[PDB]
C-alpha cells in the first residue's frame, strides 16, 4: 500500500496468545482520497480462498 501513496502508519490484529492474526487490520495512507480509491480498487479483491473486503 505504499504504491497507492505515502502511508502514514499501519497496524493489524494479532492474537496475544500463540500470536497469529485474527485476519483483519486497519490503515490510513495519508488521505481520504487515497483511502477511497484504494477501497474502490480492492473492494472485493481476490486471492486464494479468502477475499478482501474493505471499509
Amino acid at each position: 500500500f505504499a504504491q497507492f501513496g505515502d502511508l502514514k502508519e499501519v497496524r493489524l490484529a494479532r492474537n496475544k496468545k500463540t500470536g497469529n492474526s485474527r485476519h483483519y487490520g486497519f490503515l490510513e495512507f495519508v488521505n481520504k482520497e487515497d483511502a477511497m480509491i484504494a477501497q474502490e480498487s480492492m473492494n472485493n479483491y481476490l486471492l486464494m480462498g479468502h477475499l478482501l473486503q474493505v471499509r
Partner: protein, 70 residues
C-alpha cells in the same frame, strides 16, 4: 489531490499494466499489397499424361526438293 502514484496502480491491478501498444510508423502516405508468398505449381497429376513427340522434326520440315530449271 491526484494521488499520482496510485493512479498508476489504479489501472495496474484491474488491467495488468499491458497498456502500451506498438506504433510502427508508415512514412509512406500510401499503402500497397505486401509481397507475400507466391508458391510453386507442384501438381498431383500431369496435365496431358504424355510428353508429345517432336511435332516439327526435320523429315517433316523438308517436304521436297525441286527439280526445276531455275
Amino acid at each position: 489531490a491526484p494521488s499520482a502514484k496510485a493512479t498508476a496502480a489504479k489501472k495496474a491491478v484491474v488491467k495488468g499494466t499491458n497498456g502500451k501498444k506498438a506504433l510502427k510508423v508508415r512514412t509512406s502516405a500510401t499503402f500497397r499489397l505486401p509481397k507475400t508468398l507466391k508458391l510453386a505449381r507442384a501438381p498431383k497429376y500431369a496435365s496431358k499424361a504424355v510428353p508429345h513427340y517432336n511435332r516439327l522434326d526435320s523429315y517433316k520440315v523438308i517436304e521436297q526438293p525441286i527439280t526445276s530449271e531455275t
